[PDB]
């Protein structure tokens, strides 16, 4: 995140950290994600696209730091990895960039409720906040687009939702942005999501609840003028999510 503040997981208890193991001894961070129900995490498909081998990923919940432990964290394996059929990427945008990860603990359980682990709410069918609403993004992604490392402490920032008319202007992203995407930026283009923030949540309050309104998907550069961050519009994928999720 460019700008923002450093925080702890108590402030985003539904944020999940996804890492990948390497036949060498190192685990590296991949993308962020959010807990929907005890056993399901939602992220972005482009994070798995190049290496869809579930057995090599690890998911941690209750994590405030990237490579150091946090007391209260939980580690899970990916029992199921569901990528979107129709996922496409062009010279900028990713389409249907949403993925589901069913998690299992080494003891056979899903996430347990704590002060550092909670689920986030889903919107109702195609229901979104209006442009102008301030939403928060969180993640361990880059703090400057030129850096080549990720921060060790979690960060969060607040951005505002902008309309499709503003984002589809020729000097923004033209028709690369579709009705299944949402754009969010800072009025003064000072803070934004960036590389390493993919898959994590864009949370806004809807009808009283903190709702997962978007998933970090793409953007041209980070915190660039007239180059908003584009997110997957969760309210438009509810049927898809439903057809794959079940029980507790």
């Amino acid at each position: 995140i460019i700008g923002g503040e450093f925080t702890t997981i108590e402030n985003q208890p539904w944020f999940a950290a996804i890492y990948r193991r390497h036949r060498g001894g190192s685990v590296t961070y991949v993308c962020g994600g959010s807990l929907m129900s005890p056993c399901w995490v939602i992220s972005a498909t482009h994070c798995f696209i190049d290496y869809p081998k579930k057995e090599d990923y690890i998911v941690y919940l209750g994590r405030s730091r990237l490579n150091s432990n946090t007391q209260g964290e939980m580690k899970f394996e990916v029992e199921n990895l569901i990528l979107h059929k129709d996922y496409s990427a062009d010279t900028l945008a990713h389409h249907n960039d949403i993925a589901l990860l069913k998690i299992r603990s080494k003891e056979g359980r899903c996430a347990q409720p704590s002060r550092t682990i909670q689920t986030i709410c889903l919107p109702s069918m195609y229901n979104d906040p209006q442009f102008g609403t301030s939403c928060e993004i969180t993640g361990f992604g880059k703090e400057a687009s030129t850096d080549y490392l990720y921060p060790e402490q979690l960060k969060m920032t607040v951005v505002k939702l902008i309309s499709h008319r503003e984002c589809q202007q020729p000097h923004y992203y033209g028709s690369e942005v579709t009705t299944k995407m949402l754009c969010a930026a800072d009025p003064q283009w000072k803070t934004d999501s960036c590389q390493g923030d993919s898959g994590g949540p864009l949370v806004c309050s809807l009808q009283g609840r903190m709702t997962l309104t978007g998933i970090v998907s793409w953007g041209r550069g980070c915190a660039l003028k007239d180059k908003p961050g584009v997110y997957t519009r969760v309210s438009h994928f509810l049927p898809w999510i439903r057809s794959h999720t079940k029980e507790e």
């Binding site: 402030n11 539904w14 129900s37 005890p38 909670q118 689920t119 709410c121």
Partner: peptide
């Protein structure tokens, strides 16, 4: 206790 979506404690 139990999950209450969207709640920070």
């Amino acid at each position: 206790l139990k999950f209450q979506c969207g709640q920070k404690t």
